[PDB]
Each structure stands twice: as structure tokens, then as C-alpha cells.
Design a protein around this ligand. Structure first.
Ligand SMILES: [Mg+2]
Ligand SMILES: [Mg+2]
Lengths: 241, 241
């Protein structure tokens, strides 16, 4: 009874069932150990600052199909990665199941310079959209890409696949059929000082690279036309051209 | 009490007072003899087909400040122009004062190849938007450019200025601050078989070439960012890239 997608959650996830929470809807990958996609819905009631971060194994998954906190030991030192959120904590932690934002189904080993740099700056602008009086929702889908060998977490024996990049698809209010939208894609090795505005892409590129269909409930004609056209939502997020 | 603009009618027109009708809001130019801009609001209830075209002098204007039917005598033979509508007849002819769509304040001498070609095909797609279940309004502003000498109507003694080009700025539903938008600009000499999708521009370009501020009630930051960025509404009208 919770719809975190509005226009249909993505198809093409490796799991036929998705986890549905107030914080987000997520589709796990038991092979990579990370979520294929995470969909969430920011409203005026969802942001909450200063929450704590008790990393925890997601109790709704089989423990063999996801990571545990122990699996991150030594990762920062060896790989210069953080425990990076997919659905962002500060944008969503006002919901009733907020601690699930720190479940490791919502985390990947994300390069620190990306997590703390352009990815964070994009999160900040994404969240700020909800402060506009005429913006009542931000609906986002985010996830990883696996396109090159990224090495392995040193602290685990579990088979897993570290992402090589991350993507984020955003629209406001009711539907990208009528409302502004955006899509971004960042390599893991994006420089710390990068401008997130330089990473705009089409939804079609993300779909072709991921094997997903985003906004899967839209009419075919809407999908074809809008997914090959970069959106204008980034212009409201401080981007030029 | 009638709001044909939603987000503020344009500023900068030569007349300090505009004519407000159910069919449109119009700002006349007593020097050129044509409207500086015409703003209108298509809904599911506004289109009507097959209405006739009884051209008439606008009774709300001083006759010296506008054209009369006699003024068009011989114009097609001299200049290959038609009596071209600014606010489109078929999209608006169901309104309560529809005959005002054929008042000459809503008409200019528009090259036949443009009127019957790309301009008409844009009108058709603009009108078709309202058939979509999720589109409840189309708000448009249209008007001329005055940049080169296009000749004089042979049938009048009045000083007048034939337009050199025509533009159309469109958005759907509530506001371009949140909804898709488009802008188009066509020279008078546009070839008959031209594809209207090849004439997309920014709102900023139209403003700079007219002295107007369109959507003048939007916040400054919304104006600055969106007006320099071509919109995505044309993708819903059959256009690509
Ligand atoms: Mg982060
Ligand atoms: Mg016409």
C-alpha cells in the first residue's frame, strides 16, 4: 500500500519481489549483494537532519544474499570507499521506518570522493527542491552499474561485485509525462570537486547500461519520447544549459 | 477575472491596457496595427471544428489603431500573404466569444506558405496535446517579430508594419515552473513543407527579439533558469532531440 514510484517501479531487477518500506522500495541482487535499484519519494514530511548511522544487515533478506557490517572492515583503508547510501538518509529519515535507511541493502562501497563530493551536492539540490511551494514531491530512482572490475572488499569472503558507477533519475510532483525530470550518471572515480551538472544523461542511456526499464508504467509513446531527451529539472537545481 | 496566462501575462507591450476575452488576452500596437502578443488557454472544452471566418474590425479598439477587412484587398496578389490567426480558431472556437477569433486584432498578413504549412502543423500538435488524459490545459503566448521590411498592404493608406516572423511559447497544465514547455520561432519565408520541429528556440531569444517579458509573474530565479533552456514539450508533439 506504499507507492514510492508513482509511474510504476522499474522492471528488469534480478529479484522478482521488491522490499517496500516508507523509506524506499528496493530490489535486491543476491549475486552482487547490492540493490539493483532503490526508489524513493521525498515530501515536506520526509527530511530529517542529524540522524545516527547504525549500519545493520537487512532483516528482510536472507543474510547470504546481502552484506553485514563486518563485511566493510578495512574497506576505507584499502579501497578509499565509504558506506554510501542509495536512498539518502537526510532526505527521508522523517519516515516511520527510517532506520532501514542504514540497512546494508541500501548501502554500497562508494568511493569517498564521490560520496562526499558531487553525489552529496546532487543530494542536497534534490532535497532542496521540496522547499519550493509548488513542488509537493520528488520521486527518484537510483542504483549502481557494473561495467569494470573494481576489486573486492577485503573484510569478507562473500562473493560480491563492487559498483563501477551510479545513476539517479528524478522527477517532481506527479509524473515525468507532464513534470520536469532529470537523469545523472557518475563513475566511481569522479573527482571530489566535480560539478554534478556535468554528469547529466538521458534515461535511455541508464536503461541500456543497467538492463532496467525505469518509470515502467508510463505509456509507450511517453517513454519513447522523453527517455531519449535530457530533462530540464537540473536548471532548477543550479545548473546552466 | 478571466486568466488566459496563469503565470502572469507578458509585460513590455506597447499598450498599457490589454483586451481580455474568453478567447484570448491581447495587447494591441496602434503603430504596427497588429497585436504585440496574444495569450490563450486551451482546455478540453475550447476546441470546435468547422467554424466560419467572418473577418471584422475589433470593436474594442479605435478603428484608426487596427485594420479593417477592406485593408486586406489585394494583399494575397501583392505579397502572397493570408489573413493568419494569432490565437488559433479551431482550438478555441468553443468559447463564449469565439467570433472574436476572427477580429483583425487577432490577424496579421502571414505568408501563405507559413500559415498553411509549419504554422498549421504546430497548431495541430498544440491542439492535440489537450486530448491527453493527463493534460488539462495548454497555455500559449504567440506574437510577431518586426525585424525587416516585409512590404505594405496595397489596400490601405494606414501606416502599418507587417511582421517578419512569428513565435509561440507553450506550457501545459499549471506552470512552466513545474510543467513541460516549448518555444518556436518561424521566419515569414519558412518553406511550405518545413518541419515545425526544426524551429525550436528559447523563451529568452523571443524576449530579446520582442522587448517583452513572457510569464512575467514567475519568480526571478525560475525565469532566469528556464527561459535560457529549450523545453521538452516538443517531444510530446512528435519532435525528436
Ligand atoms: Mg552518501
Ligand atoms: Mg492560420
Amino acid at each position: 500500500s506504499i507507492d514510492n514510484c508513482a509511474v510504476g517501479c522499474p522492471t528488469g531487477g534480478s529479484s522478482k519481489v521488491s522490499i517496500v518500506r516508507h523509506a524506499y522500495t528496493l530490489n535486491n541482487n543476491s549475486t552482487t549483494k547490492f540493490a539493483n535499484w532503490v526508489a524513493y519519494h521525498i515530501t515536506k514530511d520526509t527530511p530529517a537532519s542529524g540522524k545516527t548511522r547504525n549500519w545493520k544487515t537487512d532483516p528482510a533478506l536472507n543474510p547470504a544474499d546481502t552484506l553485514a557490517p563486518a563485511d566493510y572492515t578495512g574497506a576505507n583503508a584499502a579501497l578509499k570507499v565509504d558506506r554510501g547510501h542509495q536512498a539518502p538518509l537526510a532526505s527521508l529519515a522523517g519516515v516511520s521506518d527510517w532506520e532501514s535507511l542504514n540497512y546494508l541493502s541500501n548501502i554500497t562501497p562508494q568511493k569517498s570522493d564521490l560520496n562526499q563530493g558531487a553525489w552529496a551536492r546532487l543530494e542536497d539540490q534534490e532535497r532542496k527542491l521540496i522547499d519550493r511551494a509548488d513542488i509537493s514531491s520528488v520521486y527518484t530512482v537510483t542504483g549502481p552499474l557494473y561495467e569494470r572490475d573494481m576489486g573486492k572488499l577485503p573484510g569478507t569472503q562473500k562473493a560480491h561485485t563492487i559498483p563501477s558507477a551510479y545513476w539517479k533519475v528524478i522527477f517532481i510532483n506527479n509524473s515525468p509525462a507532464v513534470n520536469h525530470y532529470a537523469a545523472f550518471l557518475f563513475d566511481q572515480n569522479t573527482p571530489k570537486g566535480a560539478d554534478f551538472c556535468q554528469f547529466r544523461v538521458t534515461v535511455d542511456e541508464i536503461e541500456k547500461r543497467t538492463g532496467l526499464i525505469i518509470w515502467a508504467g508510463l505509456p509507450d509513446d511517453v517513454q519513447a519520447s522523453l527517455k531519449s531527451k535530457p530533462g530540464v529539472l537540473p536548471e532548477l537545481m543550479g545548473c546552466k544549459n
